[PDB]
Ligand binder design. Structure first.
Ligand SMILES: *[C@@H]1O[C@H](CO)[C@@H](O[C@@H]2O[C@H](CO)[C@@H](O[C@@H]3O[C@H](CO)[C@@H](O)[C@H](O)[C@@H]3O)[C@H](O)[C@H]2NC(C)=O)[C@H](O)[C@H]1NC(C)=O
Ligand SMILES: *[C@@H]1O[C@H](CO)[C@@H](O[C@@H]2O[C@H](CO)[C@@H](O[C@@H]3O[C@H](CO)[C@@H](O)[C@H](O)[C@@H]3O)[C@H](O)[C@H]2NC(C)=O)[C@H](O)[C@H]1NC(C)=O
Ligand SMILES: *[C@@H]1O[C@H](CO)[C@@H](O[C@@H]2O[C@H](CO)[C@@H](O[C@@H]3O[C@H](CO)[C@@H](O)[C@H](O)[C@@H]3O)[C@H](O)[C@H]2NC(C)=O)[C@H](O)[C@H]1NC(C)=O
Lengths: 249, 50, 61, 81, 149, 52
């Protein structure tokens, strides 16, 4: 349970003369803050097992900006053996507080993989053309996580496999999809607004491909400021099935 | 629109790996280039291929 | 064309003919799709909004 | 040439010979607990018996699969049009 | 079989460490009906709700599952700016397992005009159940008949 | 009286269309320039005509 951080150069190879120390228990998680400070660098903070935020580039303006942000940064942690989905957030200077909590029975379902949204992704078109000429708005969520859980018990017929769509901001499940005759390796990829996950059916020896897409209605919201505190609506979920004769490693 | 049909066939023409093959495909990393329509694909695993 | 008062009024009908022609041309213009006047065209112009209050996490714990 | 595989359980499996060179057509094989072996054509849309062939798998590779696309130029007698 | 669930609410200045019993909620697993019955707030509770609202705090909802412990935060600034309208939703598994709850408010605004004491008398809540949904499979049977026909 | 308009100069654009067609045939997938003037998406088929 040792955690260490190194600061090296990807161009030459020689490391710099700046490295923070690590104490207490091993580092649990890290997050990259998009805001830049100091000279032209980004600020990095890490979470300890004592539930504390440690900032890598200690700088007065860095801490000033972090304090000015204050209730704007959230942190979700996922456990497999514990099966507990947690949400903490920064308050004022540096301290954790529990905001949203989720629990899942480990005996029934089991956590496998969790994918999210890439930080470096820009969407050009925010709508889609429809039958006559009407516009259709999409549902783009920068803060949305997808959980894939399977069944602990393995049987020829009895097989439980599903996908949960949870917001990291506020505990609220958008859509929960469930199958009944699928098992084995499952691969999930997340994109602009469409999720692609593949499975294998035991009842018929084949691989079925399910495509999930989230769509809004014909009218748009604020469309200037996106936040998960507001937007009390449920996006439409579309599912389709295909056949792929391969394994998809 | 093309009418819906659950039959996806693997065409040999849409094969990026013509001759060079990867014995074990652990993962693939795609990096965006700078022009507009160019993505650098690197497949890692038992061997390396770009 | 000024030769009398009564033909001076017929000139206005001559102009009404051109007005009707312009109206028909504009009707065909809109029917084909030359004038945008629709939501999808303005969708082609709307820019993405700014994202605030970002979150993050993983499965390391 | 011969593929001999042991340490297998009961069930249905698709035998396919993988080669960057001349390719092969996968063949579906059904294994019974009693010891009957029934080979059939690979069918995904349909799940019935299409054609039954003898058990001693004899795959016949058609040839090199086309990996590259073809581009044609314009003929001298054809550009006169 | 009807089981009762404990519903508690949080109200502080800027932290969240206190919780009080707000009401009782009955749940019928066999039937699928969810009934809620909470008590009414007192004038001091109303005023404390007002002063926490103008400070833009958080409204944490506490629900223990028979053990697990679920919580959910919601902005009360929109609660005070608009009228009282909360929506509670329970998330269940295929069997008798509880995932969590979420509070959603239909207005969801931030204008902040004013609120009268006549508003904040009755509690307006609606409870819903969201069981897991079964995904469809490949409809090859219709494709075969279309190809034949 | 009708012929005064029927004759006109309606059918005098086709030879230029032939030149444009040959030029577009030479360069199949190309992007020459952008026009600052905003345009509607219903002109894109006529404008691009070769880019997917
Ligand atoms: C869509 O979302 C945006 C961003 O949340 C809203 O614009 C923002 O609205 C708030 C509240 O009206 C503005 O706050 C103002 O602050 C000044 C002091 O700085 C205060 O005097 C005002 O009374 C108000 O509280 C904020 O400035 C404004 N932001 C921008 C960039 O204009 C917008 O109202 C939302 N639209 C809808 C339809 O919900
Ligand atoms: C897959 O790779 C094999 C090699 O392991 C390819 O076979 C070889 O392909 C190269 C060109 O890709 C041939 O080189 C040629 O040599 C002649 C003179 O002999 C020269 O005039 C040509 O310009 C070219 O350099 C090489 O002869 C050939 N070897 C054999 C034994 O065929 C194979 O073609 C690849 N598969 C493809 C392209 O589908
Ligand atoms: C207490 O809660 C009930 C139910 O949640 C509230 O009834 C709801 O009232 C809203 C507006 O007051 C209704 O919204 C309406 O929606 C229709 C379309 O559905 C729209 O055309 C109208 O213009 C309006 O926006 C809503 O339908 C109605 N019923 C629900 C939500 O089931 C009641 O108003 C609440 N009382 C107080 C004092 O807040």
């Amino acid at each position: 349970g040792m955690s260490s951080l190194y600061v090296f150069n990807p161009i030459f190879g020689k490391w710099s003369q700046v490295a923070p120390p690590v104490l207490k228990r091993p580092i649990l998680q890290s997050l990259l803050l998009p805001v830049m400070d100091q000279d032209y660098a980004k600020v990095l903070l890490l979470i300890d097992d004592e539930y504390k935020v440690t900032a890598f580039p200690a700088t007065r303006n860095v801490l000033r900006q972090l304090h000015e942000l204050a209730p704007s940064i959230f942190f979700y942690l996922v456990d497999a053996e514990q099966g507990r989905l947690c949400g903490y957030r920064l308050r004022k200077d540096l301290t954790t507080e529990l905001s949203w909590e989720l629990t899942i029975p480990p005996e029934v379902q089991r956590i496998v993989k969790v994918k999210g949204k890439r930080s470096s992704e820009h969407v050009h078109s925010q709508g889609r053309v429809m039958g006559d000429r009407s516009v259709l708005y999409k549902s783009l969520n920068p803060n949305l996580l997808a959980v894939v859980t399977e069944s602990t018990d393995a049987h020829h017929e009895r097989t439980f496999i599903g996908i949960f769509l949870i917001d990291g901001v506020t505990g609220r499940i958008i859509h929960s999809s469930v199958q009944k005759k699928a098992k084995g390796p499952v691969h999930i990829v997340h994109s602009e607004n469409w999720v692609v996950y593949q499975y294998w059916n035991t009842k018929a020896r084949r691989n079925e491909f399910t495509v999930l897409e989230l769509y809004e209605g014909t009218e748009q919201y604020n469309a200037t400021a996106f936040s998960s505190l507001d937007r009390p609506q449920l996006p439409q979920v579309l599912q389709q099935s295909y056949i792929f004769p391969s394994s998809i490693s | 629109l093309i009418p819906y049909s659950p039959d996806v066939q693997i065409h040999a023409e849409r094969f990026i790996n013509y001759n060079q093959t990867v014995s074990r495909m652990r993962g693939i990393y795609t990096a965006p280039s700078g022009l507009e329509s160019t993505c650098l694909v690197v497949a890692y695993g038992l061997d390396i291929y770009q | 064309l000024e030769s009398s008062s009564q033909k001076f009024l017929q000139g206005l009908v001559y102009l009404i003919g051109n007005l009707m022609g312009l109206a028909l041309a504009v009707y065909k213009c809109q029917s084909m799709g030359l004038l945008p006047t629709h939501a999808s065209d303005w969708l082609a112009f709307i820019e993405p909004p700014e994202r605030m209050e970002f979150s993050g996490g993983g499965l390391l714990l | 040439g011969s593929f001999v595989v042991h340490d297998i359980p009961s069930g249905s499996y698709v035998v396919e010979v993988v080669s960057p060179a001349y390719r092969f057509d996968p063949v579906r094989v059904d294994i019974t607990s009693k010891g009957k072996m029934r080979a059939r054509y690979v069918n995904y849309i349909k799940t019935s018996e299409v054609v039954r062939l003898p058990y001693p798998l004899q795959m016949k590779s058609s040839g090199p699969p086309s990996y590259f696309i073809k581009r044609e130029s314009w003929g001298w007698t054809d550009f006169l049009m | 079989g009807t089981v009762g669930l404990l519903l508690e609410h949080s109200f502080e200045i800027d932290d969240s460490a206190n919780f009080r019993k707000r009401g009782s909620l009955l749940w019928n697993q066999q039937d699928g009906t969810l009934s809620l019955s909470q008590r009414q707030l007192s004038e001091e509770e109303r005023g404390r709700l007002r002063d926490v609202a103008a400070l833009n705090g958080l409204y944490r909802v506490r629900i223990p599952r028979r053990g697990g412990y679920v919580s959910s935060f919601v902005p009360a600034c929109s609660l005070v700016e608009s009228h009282l309208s909360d929506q509670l939703t329970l998330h269940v598994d295929v069997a008798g397992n509880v995932v969590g709850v979420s509070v959603v408010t239909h207005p969801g605004g931030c204008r902040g005009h004013e609120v009268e004491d006549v508003d904040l008398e009755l509690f307006n809540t609606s409870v819903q159940l969201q069981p897991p949904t079964t995904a469809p499979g490949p409809e090859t049977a219709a494709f075969i008949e279309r190809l034949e026909m | 009286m009708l012929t005064d308009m029927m004759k006109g100069n309606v059918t005098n654009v086709l030879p230029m269309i032939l030149i444009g067609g040959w030029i577009n045939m030479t360069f199949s997938g190309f992007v020459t320039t952008k026009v600052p003037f905003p345009l509607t998406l219903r002109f894109k088929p006529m404008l691009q005509q070769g880019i997917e």
